[PDB]
Design a protein around this ligand. Structure first.
Ligand code: ZN
Lengths: 613, 1322
DNA sequence: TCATATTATTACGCCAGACAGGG
DNA sequence: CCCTGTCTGGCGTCCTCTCACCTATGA
């Protein structure tokens, strides 16, 4: 009754079953602002029975408690106004069932739903690892007043816009919205309204809506970008940018301080992520929340206007694919004719066959990748001119919405050399993609390769979860409990180099960590930075300009604090811009941030210089 | 030619390869196994006769009486299957066994017995199988799932790397019997051979040789060859066959015949062996340093002194040679211990052995097996002679002896079930050979090494357990038997056999509850091959390789239909064409290929036969003769897919469906999907609910017909003919005369099972699909079951789907649905709930069934009668009352009255009541008694009259050869009829023959109706104990709503997000809205591109349907329809279908075109499907654009979507994960007993488990107060939660926390040890 | 009904941790 | 007496939903 997974510790004292809680299937609802979620009326009237009882007893409609329970058992016409007056400013904790890190419990404000499904704002889904293929979430109600304030001030979904494992934003726009942006801010060499001049972004959207120009048609506009070059003062500079119609329409949504060159490019997924990141580093939190919502709304709207389907003709077969396969078949014929006459060894034969099928696979991938990335060739006022294609699967790949090089490779080019479960590769590849039909043997080899992957994930998840458990129980105690340990020791952060090109730069390792002694400028004996400064982005840029060798920085393992970690030897807060506060549990967020990517990890001569120096 | 429901709607069948072997009956594993179990099969194998011929005749220990066997039988079941499911009894049969007791006198092995007695005794009841492969165990309908276990017979396993931490391989060898003790041999890293029995302690293995009465010299004769040292002129020369020097270093001077052959230093090559064989070199003189390391073979004794020189297996030194040379033993036999090949493993094991003779070997084996209790001669000898060598407790079966002789390369395959000396010695020899290098190991995933148990084998093993218990009981009663005052039921007892066989059929890991929501799901739960179960591996332990697909699965096990999660690849599903071998292995069909011409004869192979041959591929182009049109063809030799010549192959695959199963060969365009999404597609396709209106997949594979027939959910006609079609109650089929028996005039009356409960609360319902007066053939379907449409298989429905992002409402995998889907009720499924109410006599008198419901007012007596219980039908919801069932003294009354659960609605469709003999008021119980009483007689006479009408006419019909006088035959009406003489010439006794029929009809009807009333007149039929037994069947009708789950056949899951109006849908320029919008972004990542080809080909199918709907609505004479139908059925490449359409009588064209105006159905088979050019060509026959993509406008803005989008028809299914079975919320209610925390689940009104990682997530924030109320006030602390509820309803959000109760439970459980845990200072 | 009290299967995979054996 | 096979214990993912089945004996 004590030990085990089902004893008292792991089953009734660390985890408890909980009143004022609910559970249902999730769905999208993209009209939401990212601090609010949809919550059904039936669940809302069940979870908030005591607040409704208290409200009903305050008005004077009833007398005893029984009367109120009969009123909400009957659900009369007056308790729905009571319910909209108990919801209004009362957050709830939404929780997806495998919570791995702290962004899997977030607090929203309810918006009542005719329905029986929790409507969950889409950007927030990338935090929960929540798709909508049958998922379920639990709602919990903060009862007391300190818990409502903790849900609004610590656990609100507007407050979690950076992942605590690093500095990367977690409210990155996921899949439909990056397709809507990548189709919006792009260009083509001729459209309606090529090379006309526009007096502002407002009439750019007016020309797109009336039907006189196209969403991607290159155009000189006059935009007024606000650069804040003074000390907190926004200076207007207006100019004519040679841009498109879609870039001006998306400029109507960008806040004041960002420059126009954040939208002047094509805006895949990495570019929109660093757009939101530069907005958070410059303009702070509230413009970044409202701008994340306006990004999501305009991405959904112009992805709807795009009509970006997928067809059977979109997967363009290379015309050179069959001759490449016949040249590889002639090469394996030469190698096996040498094998009949015994000139070569068996291992060298197997190595030569795997090498020519790897070379033919790379050539087929380059043939289809040229045939997709520049297939469109349209003329403008004369001879032809080429451009990047508006093929649907190519925009779904190039935008980074869903797809890569490998998946679009397997839908058009040959799908490689699949490997048998012995671990060694199979010498006869799967020369047929998915647009052509796989025959029987090729699909069976494919099933070898995919059954191994499903078995690996379904057995990998147990070790990933047990690793997170061991990590949060070794951490478990360590709380930021001082402000300075008063030391001069700390580890020597250098960039890491394995022997190829320099892998992880110093700005990734010494971003937001407080230096141990003051870094000498690389010239001679200068106090470039002082000895207890947090290295945020401005300091790291003045480190990259001076090409600083390596920084002696303060590390947690050198902290002199008895029973805890001081506030300087930890570093930056990582989801807050400042230093770690006195109190915030860093052992648990650290253990979750190491063990949470446990699913994505796998389970089962001489020196040649490259550069010149 | 076609049958008559085949000419209704003949599906356009793509497919180029002519099929040679039609699909076998898909439930043949279950049916053939259980038909083997119960069948009167003389020669004894296999069945119940094997059990009775093993256990009988029982003779006691010289008790001079020997009960023997004659014959067995199974009587009728007392309950047919329907009333058996209704009542709750098992569907069983009584097992009537004839037993013949003969009793001897003194001294009669040969003497005649003094007395006999014989009777048809009754032992157990065995559960029979329903005709569809199911059991009915206790009211519920269960399925035994066929196991996949290791075969009996020897296995040579390696375990090459992990032990010893030194890279040294071991080699063990397991002799797995079908029944009995396990014997394993195994090396250890000191290169010594060890035996262990039943995974016990480790004995050095040659002791088992010393247990088989082998001396040391005989063992060394077996495992070693002799090298002969002859005492000669000098230095004791050596016989040397040159094979023994292979690969070793020449230590000495190799010379003979006055010639130096090989000098010292160089290794001996095979050319030197050829020199020694050409030069005929045997005898060479050795130095004394050569014999100074070798080991003697046999014993030698000094002759004159009379003592021992050396024991066998002793290494030799020079002074030992001085001992044995001077005595007079001229021959010296040494053991050739080659370090390369012939290792000295047995000899070093003999050096490890602490034993010397046979008796100490048996004493050490007995001290291993049974410790503590002493080892005496009789006890140890009986132990070891009944370990392996008696027919009782050790039995390799026929499978085991076949594998045992096959793995040792024996010639024969049939032998005795026990082992012998030579078998154990051969296993040790093959293990030593594998260590030496020759021969190799076996793998365990190889399906030639992996047998299938099925229903008959498992029930036979449990029945044999019951029979050995009843024979120990018969041996008990007989030695205490007094004669002649007992007859054979004081000896025998029906209890242990029935107990064991109901233990297996009720509570086993394989007799499990049938997934019954779908015809597919029934027919693919019956074809399931589980690795789990008794004697097999477990879910949470193993492994990686047994969860993985091995190259012997090609055509035996489906590669892609295995459930994802904790058991992947343990719950494999059987392929389409794969039968089961005689021994239980998996044999699959192949086409025998003698020479260039591929012959149409089939021939079945298993994996231990598939390796030797060379087997072709299913789709390799052969034209008009069977000759492979290439000179090279892809085949597979020994699990290796490789390219071979035109004329080397011996077999070809039969058909191209044969790799996959019946779940994942219903997916069209399987070959274009990814493997992962085909797995998710098949596993979700098992989960579909039956819709209210079944709708014919436009893009099918043609295997829908075989699944919908072979799963017994449709009423397939037994005998062909016409129809009478009363049908409100039953289809009545008049039988054509050729299929009709001479006696038993006979017309077939099919029972339609109307609205009733499935095992997954779905609705199984049959509807007649034939009209009145319409010809049907044998094997044709008559009534469409759940999820069937004219004999095809209609799981979901086909809807117009656009691929586009639509305003974010289909973001990750969500699905946006029009209102035209929910207005038409085209997913509005029907669920049925059984609810029981009983009024058991717990304590303080019995409970009561009365409407006079207390405290509760004129809100109890409402949907019920004046005597209590729900009054049937009605629009009942949640919080209603169905069965008033409350006791007094329980001003002390209460409300246990079974009500309707919270959140559900419905209509009471049926009320069953076999209650405590008394449920009645003053008369409803007996009121209905008279109703049924008069009902029976009516139909009884009616049926007789029905036949009488047919017979009367038949009398006159035959009345021609013996009185055709039409005006002299219409005498008496209901009195007599025929009255004429005949004599001889032609036999016209027909009148007499039919006279007996009517005479017997009335005579039997009376008796038939005599028992009817007898059966009618009764309290009711059920078991005892339970008193008030009221079951009420609600039927909720759930429509579709934001939150349900839909999915196609390709793995495209979706939670339907927004239920749009019709106006806001994307309409094309023709005006029709699209029904369902999916999302294109799923398609490049999830590489299931087959849903797009299904979309385009379904678009083309409905294009033909719209074209026929125009040609038939704007009505044309049938020449233009038959021309367009002929063009639609020719269409393209060389196919198998074409049609013979000009023989459809100018009406069967029109009835076909009436059944095609919703869309022309297209069969795209599994791997030989429709190519893309045929999709384009079919889209050109309909007037649709060739790209598959139409420009679509927006319903909101009226303006065109740029870049035209894909619209087509995908067959989308509604899975039974409905959102108002998942929605749940809890504020406050009931909790558990032991702990003070809330209960768990939905059926218990309970709250969410706020688990461990959520607590770590709140610790990760600063949520200290949220966590404090999350584990103290909201959950556990009783004073805290009552103060909090009062604080909330006063308007004061403040918690008074206290200490959790489960921590004080922890303190008392820790303190209830010898542990003093406390709570210190303030 | 009201005290009487425990036997004839094996088929995980590391990975620490303690123990008798022997150069 | 310091290496050493060998044996014994102790881990092995969270959340949820549906169903059935529960010791023999006995004057
Ligand atoms: Zn410190």
């Amino acid at each position: 009754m004590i030990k085990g997974k089902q004893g008292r510790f792991r089953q009734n004292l660390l985890g408890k079953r909980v009143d004022y809680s609910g559970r249902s299937v999730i769905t999208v609802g993209p009209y939401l602002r990212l601090h609010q979620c949809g919550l059904p009326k039936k669940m809302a009237l069940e979870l908030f029975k005591p607040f409704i009882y208290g409200k009903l007893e305050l008005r004077g409609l009833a007398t005893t408690i029984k009367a109120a329970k009969k009123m909400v058992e009957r659900e009369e016409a007056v308790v729905w106004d009571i319910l909209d007056e108990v919801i209004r400013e009362h957050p709830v904790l939404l929780n997806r069932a495998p919570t791995l890190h702290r962004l899997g419990i977030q607090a929203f404000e309810p918006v009542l739903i005719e329905g029986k499904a929790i409507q969950l704002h889409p950007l927030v889904c990338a935090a929960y690892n929540a798709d909508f293929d049958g998922d379920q979430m639990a709602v919990h109600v903060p009862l007391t007043l300190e818990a409502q304030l903790e849900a609004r001030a610590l656990m609100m979904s507007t407050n979690n816009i950076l992942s605590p494992a690093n500095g990367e934003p977690i409210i990155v726009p996921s899949q439909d919205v990056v397709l809507g942006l990548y189709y919006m801010t792009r260009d083509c060499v001729n459209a309606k309204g090529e090379g006309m001049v526009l007096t502002g972004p407002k009439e750019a959207e007016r020309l797109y809506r009336s039907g006189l120009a196209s969403l991607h048609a290159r155009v000189k506009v006059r935009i007024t970008e606000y650069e804040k070059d003074a000390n907190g003062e926004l200076v207007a500079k207006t100019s004519l940018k040679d841009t498109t119609v879609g870039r001006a329409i998306l400029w109507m949504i960008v806040p004041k301080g960002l420059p126009y060159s954040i939208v002047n490019q094509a805006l895949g997924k990495k570019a929109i992520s660093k757009m939101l990141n530069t907005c958070y580093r410059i303009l702070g939190l509230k413009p970044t929340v409202i701008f994340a919502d306006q990004i999501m709304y305009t991405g959904f709207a112009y992805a709807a206007r795009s009509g970006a389907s997928v067809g059977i003709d979109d997967m363009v077969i290379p015309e050179k694919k069959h001759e490449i396969i016949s040249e590889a078949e002639a090469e394996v014929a030469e190698i096996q004719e040498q094998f009949q006459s015994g000139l070569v060894t068996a291992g060298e034969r197997y190595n030569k066959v795997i090498d020519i099928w790897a070379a033919a696979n790379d050539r087929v991938s380059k043939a289809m990748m040229d045939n997709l990335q520049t297939e469109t060739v349209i003329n403008r006022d004369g001879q032809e001119e080429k451009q990047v294609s508006f093929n649907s699967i190519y925009m779904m790949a190039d935008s980074g919405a869903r797809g890569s090089a490998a998946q679009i490779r397997q839908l058009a080019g040959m799908r490689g050399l699949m490997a048998k479960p012995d671990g060694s590769i199979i010498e006869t590849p799967i020369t047929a993609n998915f647009r052509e039909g796989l025959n029987v043997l090729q699909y069976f080899i494919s099933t070898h390769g995919a059954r191994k992957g499903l078995a690996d994930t379904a057995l990998k998840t147990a070790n990933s979860g047990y690793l997170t458990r061991r990590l949060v129980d070794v951490a478990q105690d360590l709380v930021v409990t001082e402000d300075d340990c008063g030391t001069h020791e700390g580890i020597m952060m250098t960039p890491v180099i394995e022997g190829g090109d320099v892998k992880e730069p110093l700005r990734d390792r010494v971003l937001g960590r407080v230096t141990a002694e003051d870094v000498l400028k690389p010239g001679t004996a200068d106090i470039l930075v002082p000895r207890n400064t947090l290295l945020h982005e401005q300091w790291c840029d003045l480190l990259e300009e001076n090409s600083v060798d390596a920084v002696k920085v303060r590390s947690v393992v050198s902290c002199d604090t008895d029973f805890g970690v001081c506030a300087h030897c930890y570093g930056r807060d990582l989801a807050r811009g400042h230093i770690i506060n006195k109190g915030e549990a860093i052992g648990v967020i650290a253990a979750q941030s190491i063990g949470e990517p446990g699913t994505q990890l796998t389970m089962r001569s001489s020196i040649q210089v490259k550069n010149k120096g | 030619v076609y049958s008559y429901t085949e000419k209704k709607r003949i599906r356009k069948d793509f497919g180029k390869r002519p099929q040679v072997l039609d699909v076998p009956y898909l439930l043949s594993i279950q049916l053939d196994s259980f038909q083997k179990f119960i069948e009167q099969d003389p020669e004894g194998q296999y069945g119940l006769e094997a059990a009775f011929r093993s256990v009988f005749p029982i003779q006691s220990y010289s008790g001079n009486s020997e009960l023997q066997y004659v014959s067995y039988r199974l009587g009728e079941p007392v309950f047919d299957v329907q009333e058996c499911q209704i009542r709750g009894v098992t569907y069983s049969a009584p097992l009537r066994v004839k037993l013949r007791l003969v009793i001897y006198e003194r001294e009669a092995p040969e003497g005649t017995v003094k007395d006999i007695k014989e009777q048809e005794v009754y032992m157990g009841e065995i559960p029979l199988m329903t005709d569809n492969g199911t059991f009915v165990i206790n009211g519920t309908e269960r399925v035994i799932v066929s196991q996949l276990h290791r075969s009996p017979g020897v296995f040579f396993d390696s375990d090459k790397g992990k032990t010893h931490s030194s890279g040294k391989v071991l080699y063990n060898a397991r002799i797995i019997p079908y029944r009995g003790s396990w014997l394993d041999f195994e090396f250890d890293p000191k290169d010594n051979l060890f035996v262990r029995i039943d995974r016990r302690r480790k004995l050095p293995a040659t002791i088992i040789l010393r247990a088989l009465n082998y001396t040391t010299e005989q063992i060394l004769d077996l495992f070693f060859e002799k090298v002969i040292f002859e005492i000669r002129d000098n230095k004791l020369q050596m016989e040397l066959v040159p094979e023994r020097l292979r690969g070793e270093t020449a230590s000495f001077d190799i010379e003979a015949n006055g010639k130096v052959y090989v000098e010292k230093g160089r290794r001996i090559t095979a050319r030197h062996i050829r020199q020694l064989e050409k030069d005929d070199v045997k005898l060479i003189e050795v130095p004394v340093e050569y014999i100074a390391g070798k080991v003697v073979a046999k014993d030698y004794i000094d002759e004159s002194t009379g003592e021992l020189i050396c024991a066998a297996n002793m290494e030799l030194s020079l002074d030992l040679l001085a001992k044995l040379s001077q005595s007079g033993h001229k021959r010296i036999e040494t053991l050739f211990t080659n370090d390369l090949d012939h290792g000295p493993y047995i000899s070093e094991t003999l050096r490890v052995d602490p034993t010397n003779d046979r008796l100490s070997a048996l004493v050490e084996i007995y001290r291993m097996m049974r410790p503590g209790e002493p080892p005496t001669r009789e006890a140890a000898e009986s132990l070891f002679e009944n370990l392996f060598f008696s027919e009782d407790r050790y039995d390799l079966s026929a499978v085991g002896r076949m594998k045992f002789n096959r793995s040792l390369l024996r010639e024969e395959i049939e032998g005795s079930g026990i082992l012998s000396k030579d078998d154990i010695i051969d296993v040790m020899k093959k293990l030593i050979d594998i260590r030496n290098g020759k021969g190799e190991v076996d793998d365990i995933d190889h399906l030639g090494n992996r047998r299938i148990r099925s229903v008959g084998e498992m029930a036979e093993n449990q029945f044999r357990v019951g029979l050995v218990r009843v024979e120990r009981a018969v041996k008990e009663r007989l030695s205490l038997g007094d004669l002649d005052t007992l007859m054979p039921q004081d000896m025998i007892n029906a209890k242990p056999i029935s107990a064991a066989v109901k233990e297996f059929f009720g509570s086993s890991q394989l007799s499990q509850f049938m997934d019954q929501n779908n015809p597919l799901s029934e027919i693919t739960h019956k074809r399931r091959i589980s690795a789990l179960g008794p004697g097999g591996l477990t879910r949470e332990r193993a492994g990686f390789e047994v969860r993985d697909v091995h190259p012997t699965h090609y055509g035996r096990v489906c590669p892609i239909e295995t459930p994802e999660g904790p058991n992947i690849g343990l719950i494999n599903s059987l392929s389409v064409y794969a039968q089961t071998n005689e021994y239980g292995f998996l044999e699959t069909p192949y086409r025998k290929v003698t020479d260039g011409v591929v012959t149409d004869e089939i021939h079945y192979l298993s994996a231990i036969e598939e390796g030797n041959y060379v087997i072709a591929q299913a789709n390799s182009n052969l034209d008009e003769e069977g000759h492979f049109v290439e000179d090279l063809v892809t085949c597979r030799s020994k699990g290796e897919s490789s390219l071979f010549s035109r004329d080397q192959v011996d077999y070809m695959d039969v058909s191209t469906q044969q790799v996959v199963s019946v779940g994942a060969s219903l997916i069209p365009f399987l070959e274009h999907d990814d493997a992962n999404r085909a797995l998710m597609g098949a596993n979700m396709q098992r989960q579909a609910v039956p819709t209210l209106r079944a709708d014919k997949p436009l893009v099918g594979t043609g295997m829908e017909r075989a699944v919908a027939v072979d799963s017994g959910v449709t009423a397939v006609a037994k005998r062909g003919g016409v129809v009478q079609y009363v049908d409100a109650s039953r289809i009545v089929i008049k039988v054509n005369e050729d299929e009709m028996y001479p006696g038993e005039a006979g017309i077939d009356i099919y029972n339609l099972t109307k609205y009733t409960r499935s095992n997954q609360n779905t609705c199984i319902n049959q509807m007649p699909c034939v009209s009145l007066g319409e010809p049907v053939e044998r094997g044709d379907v008559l009534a469409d079951g759940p999820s069937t449409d004219l004999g095809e298989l209609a799981l979901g429905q086909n809807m117009r789907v656009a691929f586009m992002p639509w305003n974010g409402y289909n973001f990750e995998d969500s699905i946006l649905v029009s209102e035209r889907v929910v207005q038409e009720d085209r997913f509005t499924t029907i669920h049925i709930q059984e609810l029981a109410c009983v009024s058991r006599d717990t304590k303080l008198g019995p409970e009561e069934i009365t409407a006079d419901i207390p405290n509760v007012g004129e809100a109890a007596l409402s949907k019920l009668d004046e005597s209590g219980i729900v009054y049937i039908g009605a629009e009942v919801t949640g919080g209603d009352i169905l069965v008033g069932k409350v006791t007094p003294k329980g001003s002390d009354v209460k409300d246990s009255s079974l009500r309707v659960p919270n959140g559900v609605s419905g209509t009471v469709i049926d009320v069953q009541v076999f209650t405590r003999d008394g449920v009645e008021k003053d008369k409803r119980a007996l009121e209905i008694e008279e109703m049924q009483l008069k009902q029976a007689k009516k139909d009884l006479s009616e049926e007789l009259q029905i036949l009488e009408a047919g017979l009367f006419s038949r009398i006159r019909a035959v009345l021609v050869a013996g009185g055709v006088e039409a005006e002299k035959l219409d005498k008496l009406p209901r009195d007599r009829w025929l009255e004429l003489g005949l004599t001889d010439e032609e036999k016209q006794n027909q009148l007499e023959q039919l006279a007996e029929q009517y005479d017997e009809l009335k005579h039997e009807f009376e008796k038939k109706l005599e028992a009817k009333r007898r059966k009618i007149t009764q309290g009711d039929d059920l078991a005892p104990g339970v008193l008030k037994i009221v079951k009420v069947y609600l039927a909720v009708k759930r429509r579709i709503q934001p939150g349900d789950k839909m999915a196609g056949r390709h793995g495209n899951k979706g939670v339907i997000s927004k239920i749009n109006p019709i106006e806001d849908m994307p309409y094309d320029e023709n005006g029709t809205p699209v029904d369902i919008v999916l999302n294109p972004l799923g398609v490049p990542s999830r590489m299931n591109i087959g849903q797009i080809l299904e979309t385009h080909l379904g678009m083309a199918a409905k294009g033909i349907g719209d074209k026929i709907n125009a040609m038939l609505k704007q009505q044309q004479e049938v020449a233009k329809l038959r021309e367009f139908i002929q063009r639609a059925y020719d269409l393209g490449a060389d196919v198998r279908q074409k049609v013979d359409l000009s023989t459809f009588s100018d009406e069967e064209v029109m009835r076909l075109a009436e059944n095609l105006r919703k869309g022309m159905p297209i069969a795209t088979p599994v791997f030989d499907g429709a190519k893309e050019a045929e999709i384009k060509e079919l889209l050109k026959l309909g007037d649709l654009p060739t790209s598959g993509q139409i420009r679509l406008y927006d319903g909101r803005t009226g303006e065109q979507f740029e870049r035209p989008v894909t619209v087509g028809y995908m067959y989308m299914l509604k899975l039974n994960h409905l959102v108002d079975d998942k929605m749940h919320a809890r504020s406050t209610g009931s909790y558990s007993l032991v702990t003070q925390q809330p209960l768990g689940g939905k059926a218990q009104f309970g709250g969410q488990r706020f688990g461990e990682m959520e607590v770590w997530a709140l610790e990760a924030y600063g949520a200290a107060y949220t966590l404090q109320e999350m584990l103290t006030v909201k959950s556990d602390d009783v004073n805290g939660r009552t103060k909090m509820y009062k604080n909330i309803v006063d308007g004061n959000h403040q918690m008074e926390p206290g200490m959790p109760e489960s921590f004080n439970v922890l303190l008392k459980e820790i303190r209830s040890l010898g542990i003093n845990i406390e709570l210190e200072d303030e």
